[PDB]
Design a protein around this ligand. Structure first.
Ligand SMILES: O=P([O-])(O)O
Ligand SMILES: O=P([O-])(O)O
Ligand SMILES: O=P([O-])(O)O
Ligand SMILES: O=P([O-])(O)O
Ligand SMILES: O=P([O-])(O)O
Ligand SMILES: O=P([O-])(O)O
Ligand SMILES: O=P([O-])(O)O
Ligand SMILES: O=P([O-])(O)O
Ligand SMILES: O=P([O-])(O)O
Ligand SMILES: O=P([O-])(O)O
Ligand SMILES: O=P([O-])(O)O
Ligand SMILES: O=P([O-])(O)O
Ligand SMILES: O=P([O-])(O)O
Ligand SMILES: O=P([O-])(O)O
Ligand SMILES: O=P([O-])(O)O
Ligand SMILES: O=P([O-])(O)O
Lengths: 94, 242, 382, 343, 95, 98, 196, 44, 49
């Protein structure tokens, strides 16, 4: 005779085995259907995704202010060591 | 062929008139008694309903036609009576606010090419490599906060999968497949013509109005002796031609 | 047509009546193992008498108030609800149809995160400037200049060329545009331009930053007042050469089109700055922004709260127009709103939503209420 | 670590930010309103993310002790409230058009016969009463407001044949055919104060008749989440989250230890030695030496018995899951959530 | 693994706790066996209840629903006349 | 060296729900035949203004649960993601930097 | 910002890419077919992501106005079509074996009595009618095709006791016991043109 | 009707999003590769 | 059913669990097709290689 199995089948005939009831440890063994049968529809990766520097620029060179007299001269109302990047922000891709 | 209907929201109204004279159902039945108004964009009376632009009249008609619900209050039909192609299951009312382009005083009509948001971090007008510099976004206008812009409200609905239904039944209810008015038409001392007029939202391509004239499309099959099968077809009204 | 309708089972008997009795008994005895029911039409036929009136008669009536009281705390309407001769009215079909103007106020935020530069590192500045006096006051700059130019002269960055072969300079009111840059990651030295925020526009992290446009080309520079017919903007070019460039050979490598704009943070707040100071400054280049907490605001489930119930000085009235004896007798002791929640639950499925009554039950995410921490599938490095 | 970041973000946004204010702080250099019911206060108070990090009670299913007593319906993943916010739109300024049902039991299903009737009702303008926010902030102070432009009454009439309607009217005017309705909840409702940190709530009901008494239901509310309906307007109601009293969003039921009931201060009910601890209803036990807890939690076997009988008539012939359609949204089994952890 | 202790608890949102005034707690009719016997133990009785709760560091409220019959009967004897009789029992009506 | 690639758009291709389209119906010059072998009068009489394929879609829905799939008849109803058709933009829980 | 990126990829793949062609462009340096029903056309036209960006009607539940009138079933998230694609396999070359039901109302549920019957049917080869794609491109032009190797008719019979079966047949040959059926849709169907 | 046959879904059939090939590669990154260029012709 | 199961066996299993098979094959009523029933668990699958 098989009493344990008989009770499993009995429980399924009386009610909804997807519901849990802690009193009897009534929580049926199952698996993720998407693990048992892999459905590989790929990924929606059309848009590239980027990592940026904390300051959103990365490497900069140092620049002084200049003004036109065309001849150009140092503009003494401007800091002589400003950090500015040329081009796009440094980025990495994931 | 397959039931994947998705343009039901584009109907505005339909009138139904027998012999060019007799508006149906007429009889002062609906709030707008000379036609079926499906949706209203201008609605001074506030006849729209359920937080979208569908009218109280049409919502009554579709709820009676599908569920016999309407004379004793509106409520959710029982799930098993409200199936995949039924009205309530598919009814999707929706609203949004947008900037009021007339009355928001600072409004600027900035086209796509001149908007920026995530400048420096995304590609310009393409799903391509990031370009630009970090800079305040110029778009979209905030609809929220202490500096929310002057706005207007838009509302509408979707109702995919269904066909719109107008039962030829005196109270719109399902009381029998052979309707009360179907039976009365038997005592019509004459033949009648019908005009209908549908008003729809314009679409910039060729579309088709699909009307299902609901009738009895019947066959009776007789097999009197081995290997003999005989069939009598009757579609009525709108009896066949092929 | 009636003999036809009978013959085609459009009207007339159902199959248990028109089929031979021997067949009906046969079907009844064998139905559980071979079913014949679907092979025989069973007509259904509406009644044609004594159900519906043939007279002219409205289905839905709209009553407007005959009196109303608009107070500080409440709004009271009176109707003459008329039930005509030869009609009955189920009160379940009645409701109050309300139109008005709602302001949910400045604490309403129907989303998480920001609408503005959401991809910006949260402590990254916009390209911007500040002043500092250690003393003479100088202007300082930080950022990047992404628009490559053919050249830079005193007229700004050259963005193109004529059919007359003459240079085309940026129109400062909208060019260069911050969203534009080199189109690939990949020989000479190259000159660049960009926009920058002036010192008077107090620094905010890029993340969260919005400034309304002041022209249809998306530029944001503040428009100058008392200009007359000529639109003028707060925009000035700032030119730069390498700090290490020979003094006798200075020429612009970078030009920034600096402007003041109406900088706002409608949906983020500052979660770190080094001190109480608000100004554009070197240290404030690294302020950090965080998005404001979401806060949905709507009317209540089933519009609870809108109508007074169980509330002594605001009792509803339904009275015969002859008497005045009110058929509504309410008690502070009764709970009408909750009674209705429980009634709805017993009648139907409260997980279904119905817009008409705002019937959309309060719920929560069970995985938030009770944290189930099965950790993470981080076995592969990314 | 993408997965770890997804989980830590989820925990912070959904749990840590909703911890009670006592777990938060205000940085020096930040000035927040002194009114703690305001959005700017709730938005500006800082929460350490490591209070609910990705290792929080790792391997357990467990609600956080402080969170049990926080209204879980005041939340941005309250999907009903989110839907109701979005039915109006995504902006603060909303001209609105809604239909409001009649809920009073004596009239909401009445069949009204021919005649003209005066029908009048009063509507609230109080934003904390008529609107709901997920944070629960005081909407009066935080600038919400409504005006009513028009309220019309709509009514629908089955287009009944006139001979049939007339025969129906005449029958329904007979006193033997009077209509009658019970309120669904069908109770006298009573609220009793529980001061902060009190553990004993004694009540008396002065002597009366109990004929037809059906029983008791009960729960616990926060005073701040319970408005007075004692008059037109409640100035002390400075909260706009869910109001369990009115809407059924109860969430403090786990805080009851026990109730005892005594007619005529001398006869214990049910007494009769019916219960394991027969002199009271013990809901839950911390010290549980005979072994009376049940179902892998601290709820007692008696209480589990009483609630299963009270909802489903299940208990005398074994405990089992009730049929789904009998176990509805506010039912016991559907909502029962036993939990354990080690520390 | 560290030396540990175990903690057990439950949540039960959305319900009110129920104690039916029925002799076996079962639903055998809206008007209960014990509600009917109270017409025969036909005196008035006082009631005392003592709830014990976990401390909460803010004021709270005990909400008790005393389950009774809360009824109206509506009479419409002539055109435009409506008369309602209310009875809540037990716990008969106040102002 | 700096050319950029994007994946081609997905394009699922199968037979239709309930194998719609495979058999001719309601199509005059391609009418099916079921007849008694001798005296071959066709008992199938079809019409161009009848719609047998849609009629069957609706019949199936009235008889059972169309969210369930049955491979034998390719019975797998056309659907769409509700959160694609109607965008619900509640933002993102990006409070913590990553 | 991982969360912002997931949302933006989702909106782009599932919404922006399905916007009507009038929202798209062809880069100079890109040559597409003039046949607009073609996969290479639908795959090559470029969509600016900022048309459906992560701030699209932010805080609203709202279908986009242009998308309301775009067939939403022609999509890679149509789970029924995706399942029907995958029932066949993941490659373009598929030896298939299927069972196709009879849907004609007059015979689909008929109880057919002893006898020999001529039963004939016609099957389509047109890949636009018999196949479905999620993009809705012209599969004739885009090189799909089908061959039928064989079509067999299967019929199942309840193993009925012969005497009981004789009784049943005898009853069903009486015209009183004629079977009858109504087409489920039960309608005369009409299409009327609506010009652009 | 039990039908067997040969189906070719054709070159537009693509039952997935994304690529089967080097899916983790930044989308503008080259393979390791060479080219020639003349301003004498050289390999880079 | 688009897998390597035979028509014979599919008939026996559908009859054995649901009495379905002599009058067409169709999806059984959900409440007769429970956790351990045939239809609920039947998963036909194909691939190319
Ligand atoms: O795995 P999916 O359904 O989010 O592509
Ligand atoms: O009249 P409304 O409800 O369409 O604004
Ligand atoms: O309405 P009649 O003209 O058909 O009798
Ligand atoms: O028996 P008959 O009339 O069908 O020849
Ligand atoms: O008339 P039959 O039954 O002998 O063909
Ligand atoms: O004249 P008809 O509508 O019966 O064909
Ligand atoms: O048809 P009647 O009785 O409503 O006049
Ligand atoms: O309520 P706010 O405007 O300070 O966010
Ligand atoms: O059943 P729910 O309202 O918790 O999703
Ligand atoms: O004896 P318990 O309370 O640990 O089960
Ligand atoms: O199968 P149920 O018992 O959860 O409805
Ligand atoms: O008795 P009544 O129907 O004339 O009011
Ligand atoms: O966001 P739209 O496309 O409905 O305006
Ligand atoms: O088929 P039998 O049992 O009648 O020979
Ligand atoms: O051969 P039967 O039809 O008379 O049984
Ligand atoms: O047969 P179903 O509706 O329970 O799946």
């Amino acid at each position: 005779r098989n009493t344990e199995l008989s009770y499993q089948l009995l429980l399924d005939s009386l009610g909804d085995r997807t519901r849990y009831f802690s009193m009897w440890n009534q929580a049926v063994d199952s698996y993720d259907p998407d693990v048992r049968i892999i459905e590989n529809h790929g990924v929606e990766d059309e848009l590239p995704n980027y990592c940026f520097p904390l300051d959103a620029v990365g490497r900069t060179d140092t620049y002084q202010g200049i003004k036109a007299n065309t001849t150009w001269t140092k503009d003494d109302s401007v800091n002589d060591a400003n950090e500015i990047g040329k081009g796009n922000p440094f980025a990495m891709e994931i | 062929l397959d039931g994947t209907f998705y343009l039901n929201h584009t109907f505005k109204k339909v009138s139904i008139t027998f012999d060019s004279s007799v508006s149906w159902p007429g009889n002062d039945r609906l709030l707008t008694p000379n036609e079926f108004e499906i949706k209203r964009t201008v609605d001074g009376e506030g006849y729209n309903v359920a937080q979208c632009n569908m009218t109280k009249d049409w919502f009554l008609v579709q709820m009676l036609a599908h569920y016999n619900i309407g004379y004793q209050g509106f409520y959710v039909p029982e799930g098993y009576k409200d199936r995949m192609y039924s009205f309530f299951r598919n009814f999707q009312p929706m609203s949004r606010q947008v900037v009021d382009e007339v009355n928001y005083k600072d409004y600027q009509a900035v086209t796509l090419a001149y908007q920026h948001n995530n400048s420096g971090f995304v590609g310009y007008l393409a799903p391509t490599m990031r370009q630009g510099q970090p800079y305040p976004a110029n778009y979209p206008y905030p609809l929220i906060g202490k500096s929310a812009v002057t706005s207007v409200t838009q509302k509408k609905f979707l109702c995919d999968r269904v066909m719109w239904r107008i039962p030829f039944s005196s109270n719109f209810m399902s009381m029998g497949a052979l309707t009360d008015l179907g039976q009365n038409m038997l005592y019509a001392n004459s033949a009648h013509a019908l005009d209908m007029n549908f008003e729809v939202d314009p679409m910039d391509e060729s579309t088709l109005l699909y009307v299902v004239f609901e009738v009895f499309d019947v066959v009776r099959v007789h097999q009197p002796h081995r290997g003999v099968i005989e069939a009598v077809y009757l579609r009525t009204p709108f009896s066949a031609g092929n | 047509m009636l003999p036809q309708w009978a013959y085609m089972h459009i009207a007339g008997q159902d199959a248990s009546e028109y089929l031979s009795p021997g067949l009906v008994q046969f079907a009844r005895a064998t139905d559980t193992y071979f079913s014949l029911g679907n092979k025989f039409r069973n007509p259904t036929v509406a009644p044609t008498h004594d159900v519906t009136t043939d007279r002219s008669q409205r289905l839905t009536l709209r009553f407007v108030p005959v009196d109303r009281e608009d107070n500080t705390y409440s709004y009271k309407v009176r109707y003459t609800l008329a039930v005509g001769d030869n009609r009955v009215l189920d009160m379940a079909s009645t409701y109050f149809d309300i139109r008005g103007v709602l302001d949910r106020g400045p604490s309403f935020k129907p989303y998480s995160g920001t609408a503005y530069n959401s991809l910006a590192p949260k402590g990254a500045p916009n390209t911007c400037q500040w002043t500092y006096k250690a003393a003479t006051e100088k202007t300082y700059t930080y950022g990047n200049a992404p628009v490559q130019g053919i050249n830079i002269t005193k007229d700004g960055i050259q963005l193109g060329t004529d059919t007359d072969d003459q240079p085309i300079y940026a129109d400062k009111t909208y060019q260069p545009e911050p969203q534009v840059g080199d189109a690939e990651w990949h020989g000479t030295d190259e000159k660049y331009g960009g926009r920058a925020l002036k010192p008077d526009t107090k620094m905010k992290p890029c993340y969260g930053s919005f400034a309304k446009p002041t022209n249809k080309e998306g530029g944001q520079a503040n428009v100058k007042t008392g200009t007359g017919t000529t639109k003028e903007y707060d925009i000035d070019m700032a030119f730069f050469d390498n700090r290490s460039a020979a003094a006798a050979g200075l020429a612009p490598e970078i030009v920034l089109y600096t402007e003041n704009v109406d900088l706002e943070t409608p949906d983020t707040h500052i979660v770190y700055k080094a001190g109480t100071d608000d100004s554009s400054s070197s240290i404030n280049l690294g302020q950090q922004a965080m998005p404001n907490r979401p806060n949905y605001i709507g009317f209540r489930d089933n519009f609870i709260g809108l109508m007074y119930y169980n509330s002594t000085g605001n009792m509803g009235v339904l009275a015969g127009q002859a008497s005045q004896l009110n058929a509504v007798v309410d008690l502070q002791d009764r709970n009408t709103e909750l009674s209705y929640q429980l009634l709805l639950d017993s009648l139907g499925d409260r997980t279904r939503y119905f817009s008409m009554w705002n019937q959309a039950v309060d719920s929560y995410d069970p995985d938030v209420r009770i944290i189930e921490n099965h950790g993470v599938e981080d076995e592969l490095p990314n | 670590n993408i997965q770890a970041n997804l989980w830590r973000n989820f925990l912070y946004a959904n749990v840590a930010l909703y911890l009670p204010d006592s777990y938060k702080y205000t940085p020096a250099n930040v000035t927040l309103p002194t009114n703690t019911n305001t959005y700017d206060y709730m938005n500006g108070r800082v929460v350490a993310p490591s209070l609910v990090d990705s290792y929080i009670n790792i391997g357990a299913r467990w609600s956080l002790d402080p969170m049990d007593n926080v209204n879980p319906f005041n939340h941005h993943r309250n999907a009903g409230l989110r839907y109701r916010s979005m039915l109006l739109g995504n902006g603060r300024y909303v001209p609105f058009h809604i239909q409001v049902p009649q809920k009073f039991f004596a009239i909401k299903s009445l069949l009204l016969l021919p005649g003209s009737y005066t029908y009048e009702w009063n509507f609230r303008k109080d934003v904390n009463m008529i609107l709901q926010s997920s944070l629960g902030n005081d909407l009066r102070t935080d600038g919400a407001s409504i005006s009513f432009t028009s309220i019309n009454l709509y009514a629908t009439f089955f287009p009944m044949a006139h001979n049939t309607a007339s025969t129906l009217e005449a029958m329904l005017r007979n006193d033997t055919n009077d209509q009658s309705f019970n309120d669904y909840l069908s109770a006298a409702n009573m609220l009793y104060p529980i001061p902060a940190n009190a553990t004993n709530v004694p009540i008396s009901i002065p002597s009366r008749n109990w004929a037809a008494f059906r029983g008791w239901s009960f729960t616990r509310l926060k005073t701040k989440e319970t408005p007075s309906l004692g008059s037109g307007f409640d100035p002390y109601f400075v909260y706009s989250g869910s109001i369990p009293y009115l809407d059924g969003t109860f969430y403090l039921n786990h805080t009851f230890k026990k109730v005892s009931i005594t007619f005529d201060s001398s006869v214990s009910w049910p007494g009769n030695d019916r219960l394991l601890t027969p002199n009271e209803f013990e809901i839950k036990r911390t010290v549980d030496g005979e072994g009376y807890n049940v179902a892998q939690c601290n709820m007692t076997k008696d209480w589990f018995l009483v609630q299963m009988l009270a909802h489903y008539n299940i208990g005398y012939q074994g405990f089992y899951v009730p049929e789904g359609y009998k176990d509805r949204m506010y039912s016991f089994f559907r909502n029962f959530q036993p939990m354990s952890r080690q520390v």
